Every structure is written in C-alpha cells, then in structure tokens.
Amino acid sequence: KLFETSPFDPLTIKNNQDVVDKLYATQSSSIQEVVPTKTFATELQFGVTS
Amino acid sequence: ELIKVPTIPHNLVLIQSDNGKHALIKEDLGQWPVETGISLVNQAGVFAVQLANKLGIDKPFVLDAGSNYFTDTSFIDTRKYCTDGLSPREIQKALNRQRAYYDRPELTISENKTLLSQSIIYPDADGNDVSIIFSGAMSHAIFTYAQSQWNKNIIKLDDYIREITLTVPKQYRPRRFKEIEHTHGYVYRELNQGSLLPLVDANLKESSSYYFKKLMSSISNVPVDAQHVSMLTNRLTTANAPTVRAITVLTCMFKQFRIGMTYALDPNIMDVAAATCMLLFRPAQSISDEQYRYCLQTMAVFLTNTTYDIVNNDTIDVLKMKLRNQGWPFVERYNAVEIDMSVEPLRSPGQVGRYYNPFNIDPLTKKHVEDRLEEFINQVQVGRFRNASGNAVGTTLAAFLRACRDKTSANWRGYSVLVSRYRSLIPNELFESLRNISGEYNINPQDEHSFFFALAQINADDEFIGAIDKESAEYLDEYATLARDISNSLTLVKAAFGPLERTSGSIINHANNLNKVINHVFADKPLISETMLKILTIDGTTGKDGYRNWLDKLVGHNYPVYVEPVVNIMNFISARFVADSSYFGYTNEIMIMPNHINVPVDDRFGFRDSPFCTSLPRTIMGNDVRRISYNVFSMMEDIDDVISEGFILYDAYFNFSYDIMTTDGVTRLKEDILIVTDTGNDIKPIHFYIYFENRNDKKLRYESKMNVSYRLYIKTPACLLPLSDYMRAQHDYVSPSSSRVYIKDPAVVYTRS
Amino acid sequence: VGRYYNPFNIDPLTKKHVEDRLEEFINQVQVGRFRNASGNAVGTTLAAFLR
C-alpha cells in the first residue's frame, strides 16, 4: 500500500479549494515538517464598511 | 470573509402589448423620494448605501458566474450559453409576437440561432471567464465599478508575505502552506495603516494613562526569583517591588517617560542613597532638569550639613562644584544606550525601533557607562562628610553602592529581555508621543533604594511568554479598531461641521448641529467601538461627552485620510444619482400644457398620448416656453391666467411613477394636476397610466381630445428602451478564474508552544 | 444688536483658552516645590485640580 491513509479521495473533490481543505484534515496522518499550533499574526488592519 | 456572488443582477423586465405590436425593455432600480430645499448630494449618499445593498456590492465580493452555462444539442455548436441576465427566449417570443401582428413570417432557424446565442461565456488569456448578457446600463456600470475597487485589495499570497517579512520575529516557527496555496493562493487585505496621532495628540493625558495602566497590569505579574546601617536596613521593603519593576521597564520602553521622587523634609542617609541610585541606575532621558536639581540639593543638604534655604537659589553648576569640593563625585546623570530591535515594529513600515538598555549598562562593555565607578566609590569610602571626623557616613554609603552595582551587573540581562518584549507591543508613534503628564507613578525614596538593594532575578518561564503572545494579538486588534474609528470620525467632521465665528448665531448653530450628530451616531449600534470609549472615559466623563469634545477639536484638521474602496463605490453611485435622475424616479422639471397645443413627444414606444418627450421644448409655436420656479408658482394668485398658455415648472425635484398597461385606453394621471388652497398652490403626486395606441379607435381618440383638458409632460426616462434596440443591452462581466484558493488566515508563523 | 463676553475666557475661533501657554503652566506647577523647599504636595494637588 502506497499510503496508510490516502491524502484525499479524488472522487469527492470538485475544485482546488476542496483539495486544500481535505489536505488539512488528513495532515495528522502524515509526517509533518511543522506540527500546527495557534497562529501568530504581526499585521492586522480593519477597513471601513458600508 | 470574502463573499462570492453567483448571479448577475440584470434588473430587467420586458413589457409587451396584448396585440404584440409594441414592446420595450425597462430597467427597474426602484423609487427613491427626494426632498426639495436641502442638499441633494447628502440624500444621494444615504440612497447610495441602500442601492449597493440591493445590488449586493456593499461588502467585498468576487463574482463566480463561470458555471452558469449550458451547451446546445448541435454538433458544431461547442459554445457555452449563459443563464444569467434576461434570457434570449423572452426576446424571441416578444419579437415573434410582433411579427404576428404585422403578418410577417416568424423568425427563421438561422436568426433564431443567432438570437439565442447572444449570451455566451468565454475564457480570456489570463484564465478568467467573461459573461456577455442582457442587463441594464446603470446596473452594469455600478456592478463593474465595485468589482474594480474590491479587486485592488486582492493580492497573491507571495506578495502579501513579501510585505510582512520584516515584521516576523525569530522565536516563532514558520508555517508551511500547501503547494496549491503558493501557486493559486489569494488574500483580501487592506494593507493601509492609519495614523493613531489624531487621538493621541488631542488627548495626551487620557491616552498615555490608558496604555501605561494596561502595560503595568501585565509587567507587575512577571515571575521573579526569590546606626546608619540599621536605619537603611529598617527602611528596606518589598511590598511595592512589582510596581517599581514595571516603572523600570516603562522608563526603558518609551522615549521620554519621566518619573519623580519626593524626598522627606529632613533628608536622611536614606535620601542620599535613593538620590545616588536614581542618578546612577536610571536613564538620563527619564530625569528632568528640575528633578536633577532636587536630587542634587538633597545630596548637598545632608553631606554638607546645610539646610534647604541656602541651596534653594543655587544653580546646577554651583551645586556640582559645592558637592565635588566636599568629596562627592556622583553629580552627573548618565545617558542610556539604545539597543536596536531585531525586527521592524508593528504599524511602523520601513522604520527601526529601539529601546534603552536597563540600569545604564553598555551592551558592548557589559559594565556601567561610567568608567570611573570604582574610583568614585573609593573616594566616598575615604571622604569626610557632615563636617565630622568620623567616617561612618562615607563607609556605609560605599558599602551600599557596591551592593547596588553588583546587583545591577548581574540582573541586567533579565530586565533587558523584558523591555525588548514589551517594546515590541507598542508602535513607533506611541513610543515617541506618550508622556507622563500626570505624576501618578511617583516613587518613594525607600522604595527606590530597596528596589535596587534587593534586586531579584527575572524568571521568564513558558507561562509568561505564552501570556504575552495572547496580549500581542489583543494589542494588534485594539490598534486596528482605533485606526478605523479615527478614520470614520475624521470623515464625519469634514462633511458635517465647519468654521466658527464670533457671532451668537454661529455658536448656536454649531452647538445644535453637534448634538444632532452625537445623538444619531450613538443611536442603535454606535459608530465608535468600545476601545475608543474606554480611552475617552478615563478621566470620568461619559462616553457621549468624551466623543463630543474630541469632535470639536478635530474641526479644521489637515489630517490626510486614505480613500478606502467603499468610499469610491458610494461616491460613484451618488454621482450617478444626481446625473441620471430619471433612472431613480425623479426629475428636475415638468411641463403643463393645454390639450389643444401640439407638443413634439417621443413616439418610439407607441404610446397613446405619450407623456414623455426627448427633451422639453425650447420653443412652442415660435416662442420660448415660460419657465416658473416652484416657489414663485406656489405664491401665484393669477394661476388661472398662467396655465392657459402653458409653462415649465423647475427649481424643484419632482417624484413620479408610471404604470405601463398592456391594453389600449386613455392615458391619464391618477390625480388632478394641481391643488389650489388659500395658503399657496401645490402639485399633486404624479402617477401615469400609459396605454399602447391603436390609431383607428375613434372612441378613444375623441376621449383624449375632449375628456382630458390639460396634460403633463416630463423628459423620457432613460431606463426605457425599445425592443428593436435590444443589442444596446448587451454588457460584459468578468469573473476570476475558478482555480483560485482564498486564504482566511494568512499568518506566516506558528506559536512556539 | 449687542455684545457679551464669552464665558470662561475661551476664544471661539481657536476653541481654547486665551492664554496659549496654559498647558505648559500646569506642567510647571506640577514639578514645582511650593511653601517649602522640599515638596509639600501643593504642586501635585493644585495641578490636578487646575487641569
């Protein structure tokens, strides 16, 4: 078997976004370069609304 | 979030007569009442936001209409037919019904295919898909303009990272995006930083007190590691250690944070120790010239055994000479050494941040900035003070100075890290602007000496570093909200208020207008966030009052305000509201003429006694049509003579509505043209019942000539369009490529954890 | 027609007190020592109430 758990099922995706979301869901099965944690933001602006 | 719009708002209807001879295409953007006597642009702005809400362009959006297509059954078609817009099938049925009336042949197969293939979706070189559909002119212009304005903020992920690389520290782990997000990743960021100065400059006391308290509520929680001599041992205390620690950080974190010490009326060897410690282990920037004198005077009073009266008139140089001759060498304040930050500070694009190194220690040398410290301590040990043969004062002062020097030289790195972390929280403008206007953080002489004598190692564990990371996100959120609030308030002042004179009328007008603005602003959801209210209510005034005084100050400001995309969208709609009035149900002039006078009218739509004209006639029967303003017409008492000839009413905004009826009948108004009262005249509301015309109906022809005596004419609305000109309704919409992923959290680093 | 003094010595054109050095004066009082050469807290109390 090439993978213990497949990265994603190709028959379920419909666009590029679906692949990205599926890859994030199955990333726990793979050996990760950096294990995700809470993100840290150094840049934030709020624009005026309607 | 970035919303996605599936369908295009064509806003089109097709109206055809029962017999099919006449048909037209009408764009319905609604009816908007306009009040006369007040500025039209101000009303247009209110209607602009409601119009944008109707079209779904108020919030940032990206159009996806690429999948709204179908493919024909023919083999050689291989074309995508757009579903959005007015369907060509309706135009085909309308055109076929028209041909049936004239006994013409129906549309042949070749023309049917051409008409039904008018709406298509095709890709361009860049990968976007272009939709060509039938839609209104104003709906197309407004929608496409808002698309352009929002697209300026949509940038590639790699471009966004390049803008925020300089602000990323070294302690945090880099984030690995997926390979799709690197190639096809796009984000929506404003990427404009508004200045915080308008709030800070106007309220220096309130703003400084707010930020100093917030920082000190966190620095005081830092984890820490646990005879004349009898006099100074008794005064030793620790209960106020957390407060003095945070004051130490604040002095090294800001450019000019001045603190003061209030010595006792009768100086003690406690007082001289505190004066020496502050003049040695505190930045010269945090010491004022007055505090320099007062510290020097205390040294002279105790060491020279002189009372305050003689030294009260002495200058700085005289006091230094007097102290030096007695044997006291510590008479100078020392400038701290500035350490440059590793990364660019937040909200400071292309700027370098710096902070003072604590305890006046040179980073390159790792000892005190004064190179004669050991020599100076020796002089104090051997010197004779208080005009006494005994050396008890001299030796005990040298012992404490050595202890303070040793304590500072060992604990300086821990405080330097704390200052470095807390300096990164504040931007550059706050670093240069915040001042200690109110002396609310004065230090007692016993606290100053006990702090340096009993200095404790700062322990930077994981919990404290984790707590600061939470505060960094909170600080970043607060700055963004204040910048938006400042920008909103600066725009309100320019549009609403004006200059003030020395006349009672101007003052009364300003006061009443200001109260109306404040009441409207604070009604329902307040315009100003709770963060700005906290700053403006620090003194004790209520939220309404605090905002009111700030608005008065901002009048006449020259502050530059950045023009955000939603400003341009509303401005574009407001201009079209004034320019194209007939699209929205109002006009600037009307004409009242008797029936027997023949006026040239629009005849394209086949209306019976059409109330529309291409333009209101300049001359009728060789003479210019009389024009009367509405105010003059209202006061006229000879109106019966005037309406006999006919005139044009202008200098007012007239709201009108019309109902196109498919059948044939007399075109008449719902109500009478005018109402005549004792207190002036007026024009009743205008509602048209327009009917399509059959030229050979003798009954309806006689009724039009005889039953109605006066007729009202207005300029033909531009929303109306004859069916023969349906190709003028073809418009192009561009939707971005479907192979784009939008990243909601574009942060580039993770917490160390 | 008539004329009346504006209350509290405030110029409506500048929307501030007629003395342009008022803020500087309050700060000078705060740091000042009064009634004694050593501080009696007179400066801090007076500056707080004057502001």
Closest CA to B169 of B749, B622, B753: B749
Query: What kind and span of H or E run contains B680?
Result: strand B680-683
3-class secondary-structure state, position B154: strand
Q: Report the structure determination method.
A: cryo-EM
Q: How far is C39 from chain B (nearest CA, A)?
A: 6
Resolution in A: 4.8
Phi, psi of B358 (to 5 degrees): -65, 155
Place of tokens 């050396």: B391
Q: For residue B660, how many C-alpha atoms fall within 13 Å in the half-sphere facing its CB?
A: 22
Whether B80 contacts B70, CB under 8 Å: yes
Whether B605 contacts B720, CB under 8 Å: yes
Q: How far apart (Å, rounded) are the C-alpha atoms in residues B480 and A45?
A: 5
Q: Is C31 on the interface with B (CB under 8 A)?
A: yes
Q: How far apart (Å, rounded) are the C-alpha atoms in residues B589 and B474?
A: 57
* Residues of chain A found within 8 Å of residue B176, distances taken between Cβ atoms: 32-34
Phi, psi of B412 (to 5 degrees): -75, -35
Asked if B741 lies within 8 A of A39 by C-beta distance, the reply is no
Which chains does chain C touch, 3 or more C-beta pairs < 8 A? B
Q: How far apart (Å, rounded) are the C-alpha atoms in residues B207 and B203?
A: 6
Give the other-Cβ count within 10 Å of B247's Cβ: 24
Token pair for B175: 């984030």
Q: How far apart (Å, rounded) are the C-alpha atoms in residues B494 and B499?
A: 10
CB contacts < 8 A (B, C): 41
Asked if C12 lies within 8 A of B502 by C-beta distance, the reply is yes
* Residues of chain A found within 8 Å of residue B184, distances taken between Cβ atoms: 16
Q: How far apart (Å, rounded) are the C-alpha atoms in residues B19 and B98?
A: 8
Query: What kind and span of H or E run contains B734?
Result: strand B730-735
Partner residues linked to B173 by β-bridges: B750
Q: For residue C1, how many C-alpha atoms fall within 13 Å in the half-sphere facing its CB?
A: 1
Cα-Cα-Cα-Cα dihedral of B278, B284, B287, B292, to 10°? 80
Whether B245 contacts B422, CB under 8 Å: no
Give the rounded distance of the alpha carbon of B211 from its chain centre.
22
Give the other-Cβ count within 10 Å of B240's Cβ: 14
B603-632 residues touching A, CB cutoff 8 A: none
Identify the closest residue of chain B to C41 by CA–CA distance: B262
Q: For residue B491, how many C-alpha atoms fall within 13 Å in the half-sphere facing its CB?
A: 15
Q: Any residues with CB less than 8 A from the CB of B447 and at least 6 apart, and which? A: B237, B240, B243, B244
DSSP string, B566-584: HHHHHHHHHHHHHH--GGG
Angle between helix axes B462-496 and B504-521 (nearest 10 degrees) is 130
Asked if A23 lies within 8 A of B178 by C-beta distance, the reply is yes
Partner residues linked to B722 by β-bridges: B24
- Find the largest Cα–Cα distance for chain C: 55
Whether B320 contacts B331, CB under 8 Å: yes
Closest CA to B135 of B14, B10, B13: B10
Asked if B506 lies within 8 A of C12 by C-beta distance, the reply is yes
Q: Any residues with CB less than 8 A from the CB of B20 and at least 6 apart, and which? A: B94, B97, B98, B100, B101
* Residues of chain A found within 8 Å of residue B163, distances taken between Cβ atoms: 43
Q: How far apart (Å, rounded) are the C-alpha atoms in residues B301 and B385?
A: 11
Q: How far is A7 from chain B (nearest CA, A)?
A: 12
Q: How far apart (Å, rounded) are the C-alpha atoms in residues C8 and B375?
A: 59
Whether B738 contacts A13, CB under 8 Å: no
Whether B394 contacts B380, CB under 8 Å: yes
Reading phi first (left if > 0) and then psi (alpha if -120 to 50, else beta), residue B330 is in beta
* Residues of chain B found within 8 Å of residue C6, distances taken between Cβ atoms: 502
Burial degree of B319 (CB within 10 A; 0-12, 13-18, 19+): buried
Asked if B308 lies within 8 A of C36 by C-beta distance, the reply is yes
Q: How far is B194 from chain A (nearest CA, A)?
A: 9
Sign of the torsion angle spanned by Cα atoms B626, B627, B630, B635: negative
Q: How far apart (Å, rounded) are the C-alpha atoms in residues B257 and B423?
A: 13
Q: Are strands B154-156 and B185-188 parallel, antiparallel or unpaired?
A: antiparallel
Whether B690 contacts B714, CB under 8 Å: no
Question: For A39, which of B180, B739, B750 is closest by C-beta distance?
Answer: B750
Q: How far apart (Å, rounded) are the C-alpha atoms in residues B579 and B539?
A: 49
Asked if B555 lies within 8 A of C30 by C-beta distance, the reply is no
Closest CA to B249 of B272, B218, B271, B290: B218
Q: How far apart (Å, rounded) are the C-alpha atoms in residues B547 and B549?
A: 6
Which chains does chain A touch, 3 or more C-beta pairs < 8 A? B
Whether B739 contacts B184, CB under 8 Å: yes
Identify the closest residue of chain B to C46 by CA–CA distance: B438
Give the other-Cβ count within 10 Å of B39's Cβ: 9
Q: Is B507 on the interface with C (CB under 8 A)?
A: yes
Place of tokens 């002489």: B445
3-class secondary-structure state, position B492: helix
3-state helix, strand, coil in chain C (%, to 5): 45, 10, 50
Whether B130 contacts B733, CB under 8 Å: yes
Q: Are strands B354-356 and B338-340 parallel, antiparallel or unpaired?
A: antiparallel
Angle between helix axes B137-151 and B565-579 (nearest 10 degrees) is 160
Q: Any residues with CB less than 8 A from the CB of B497 and at least 6 apart, and which? A: B510, B513, B514, B517, B551, B555
Asked if B500 lies within 8 A of C12 by C-beta distance, the reply is yes
Q: Do chain C and chain B touch with ≥3 beta carbon pairs under 8 Å?
A: yes
Q: How far is B501 from chain C (nearest CA, A)?
A: 6
DSSP string, B332-364: ---PPPEEE-SSPPTT-TT---EEEPGGGB-TT
Asked if C12 lies within 8 A of B507 by C-beta distance, the reply is yes
Whether B170 contacts B81, CB under 8 Å: no
Partner residues linked to B129 by β-bridges: B123, B735
Asked if A46 lies within 8 A of B190 by C-beta distance, the reply is yes
State the Rg of chain A over Cα: 16
Asked if C15 lies within 8 A of B552 by C-beta distance, the reply is yes
Q: How far is A1 from chain B (nearest CA, A)?
A: 24
CB contacts < 8 A (A, B): 103
Asked if C33 lies within 8 A of B311 by C-beta distance, the reply is no
SS (H, E, C) B7-33: CCCCCEEEEECCCCCCEEEEECCCCCC
Place of tokens 């109906």: B697
Question: For B265, which of C12, C38, C51 is closest by C-beta distance?
Answer: C38
